Amino acid sequence: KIEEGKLVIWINGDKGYNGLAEVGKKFEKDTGIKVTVEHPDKLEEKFPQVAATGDGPDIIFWAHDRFGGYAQSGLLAEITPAAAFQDKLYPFTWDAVRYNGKLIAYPIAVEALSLIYNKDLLPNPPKTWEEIPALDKELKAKGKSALMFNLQEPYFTWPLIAADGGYAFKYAAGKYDIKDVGVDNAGAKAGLTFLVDLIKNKHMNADTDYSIAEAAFNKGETAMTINGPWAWSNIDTSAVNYGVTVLPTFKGQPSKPFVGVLSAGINAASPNKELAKEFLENYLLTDEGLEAVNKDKPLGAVALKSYEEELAKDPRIAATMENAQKGEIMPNIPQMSAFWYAVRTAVINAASGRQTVDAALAAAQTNAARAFAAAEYKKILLLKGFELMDDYHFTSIKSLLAYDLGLTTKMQEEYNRIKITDLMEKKFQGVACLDKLIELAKDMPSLKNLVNNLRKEKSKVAKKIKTQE
Numbered sequence: 001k002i003e004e005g006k007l008v009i010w011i012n013g014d015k016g017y018n019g020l021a022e023v024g025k026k027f028e029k030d031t032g033i034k035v036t037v038e039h040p041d042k043l044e045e046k047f048p049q050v051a052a053t054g055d056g057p058d059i060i061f062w063a064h065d066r067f068g069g070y071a072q073s074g075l076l077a078e079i080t081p082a083a084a085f086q087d088k089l090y091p092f093t094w095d096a097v098r099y100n101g102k103l104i105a106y107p108i109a110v111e112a113l114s115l116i117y118n119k120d121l122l123p124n125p126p127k128t129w130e131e132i133p134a135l136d137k138e139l140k141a142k143g144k145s146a147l148m149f150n151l152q153e154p155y156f157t158w159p160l161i162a163a164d165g166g167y168a169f170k171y172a173a174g175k176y177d178i179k180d181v182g183v184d185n186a187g188a189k190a191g192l193t194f195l196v197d198l199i200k201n202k203h204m205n206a207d208t209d210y211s212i213a214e215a216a217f218n219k220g221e222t223a224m225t226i227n228g229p230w231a232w233s234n235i236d237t238s239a240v241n242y243g244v245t246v247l248p249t250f251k252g253q254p255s256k257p258f259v260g261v262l263s264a265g266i267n268a269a270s271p272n273k274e275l276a277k278e279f280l281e282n283y284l285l286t287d288e289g290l291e292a293v294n295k296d297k298p299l300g301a302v303a304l305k306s307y308e309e310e311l312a313k314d315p316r317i318a319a320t321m322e323n324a325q326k327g328e329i330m331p332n333i334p335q336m337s338a339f340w341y342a343v344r345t346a347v348i349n350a351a352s353g354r355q356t357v358d359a360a361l362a363a364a365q366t367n368a369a370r371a372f373a374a375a376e377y378k379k380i381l382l383l384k385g386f387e388l389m390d391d392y393h394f395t396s397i398k399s400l401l402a403y404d405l406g407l408t409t410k411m412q413e414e415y416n417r418i419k420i421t422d423l424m425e426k427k428f429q430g431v432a433c434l435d436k437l438i439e440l441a442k443d444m445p446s447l448k449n450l451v452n453n454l455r456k457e458k459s460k461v462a463k464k465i466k467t468q469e
């Protein structure tokens with residue numbers, strides 16, 4: 001149901017989608033192929049849901065960390081550029097889009113967070129995180145604040161969590177150990193404790209989000225923010241004179257941002273794969289194509305060598321790359337989505353006071369390190385739960401799940417057992433989806449045997465996890 005003879009492109013709303021649309025208009029004039037750029041609200045999650053049914057955009061843009069999961073799910077076409085084209089982009093950017101030996105997207109640009117500071121409020125910005133409480137107290141006396149940044153997305157807190165030792169999945173001997181997670185080690189706990197202490201002491205508010213922090217910095221209300229290159233053009237438009245610099249150190253160690261490569265994947269369901277390749281290789285990944293996007297919202301350090309030679313002269317790009325070199329390339333492994341979910345929960349719960357730092361990170365550690373087992377829990381839920389109950393009992397469960405899963409009346413009537421299994425596991429990660437069905441079915445007498453077996457399947461998996469760990 002993707003239309004043949006047209007290109008639909010999805011890219012996140014913080015990127016230069018109007019510039020990308022200009023590249024699309026040029027393509028349409030040359031080829032007669034309409035190009036429509038959209039930026040739907042929850043892109044990285046709408047795509048895997050609609051693409052799994054054969055729908056969605058021809059081309060999907062996101063940082064490379066989500067792409068290995070998309071590839072494992074059969075959502076992406078293999079990328080096979082000629083050697084001459086491969087030579088046009090930096091090898092480490094191709095590495096970010098290589099998964100299981102094959103290229104699964106075109107790399108576009110390299111993103112890392114930097115410290116952005118107001119040069120008039122703060123000519124000499126702090127070198128350490130530890131200086132920020134005293135700096136905030138100074139600025140509060142002048143009706144200003146020291147620092148505001150998005151606390152709702154763990155991407156922005158990760159550099160501080162990683163500074164003294166936190167890590168996602170351990171990398172050694174050229175491979176990631178998806179069972180060695182570094183979310184609850186001493187360094188991670190120290191970094192998140194520092195952040196939570198900033199909030200407890202009223203140097204930041206737990207509810208600060210992207211929009212609040214951007215407006216506060218761009219209006220001159222806060223002296224510093226933490227953001228990526230896409231944010232610079234809105235600061236240019238503002239009255240604020242800003243610098244982009246190395247992130248503060250923590251316990252004398254650099255902040256370690258997770259480095260993202262904005263990447264463009266081709267939907268395996270697209271009937272326009274040849275046109276998508278033409279657009280990406282010969283329109284976007286040219287000096288003129290990247291310039292059109294970059295002039296809208298800066299891309300960062302682009303993957304195209306010819307254009308990066310120009311951008312590298314910008315001290316904001318030098319600062320981006322200095323922070324990138326102190327950080328780490330994100331894994332692209334399929335477990336990244338579950339890792340980010342677990343860490344998002346931990347940061348939000350610790351910052352808001354719903355959990356201590358220790359308990360929040362302990363749970364995130366467990367959740368991320370058991371993410372490998374998510375497919376097996378889903379299989380148990382589908383094969384030993386839903387497929388073993390008649391339509392009547394399935395409908396009753398759908399009724400009980402409707403509030404939490406957002407099921408309308410039509411959805412309750414039409415959704416099959418596979419769709420419900422998928423929705424449940426997204427809402428109740430891993431083992432929680434199986435616990436949920438047990439909880440709902442425990443008091444239906446005709447499902448007594450079904451529930452008994454679900455409990456044994458649940459223990460059986462926990463045993464295999466306890467054996468393999």
Ligand SMILES: OC[C@H]1O[C@H](O[C@H]2[C@H](O)[C@@H](O)[C@@H](O)O[C@@H]2CO)[C@H](O)[C@@H](O)[C@@H]1O
Nearest residue numbers: 012014063065066111153154155260340
């Ligand atoms: O916060 C978790 C989130 O982090 C990264 O998302 C970044 C993205 O890479 C940036 O380009 C920009 O859009 O900010 C996002 C954070 O809000 C990961 O790429 C993403 O998968 C993950 O969920």
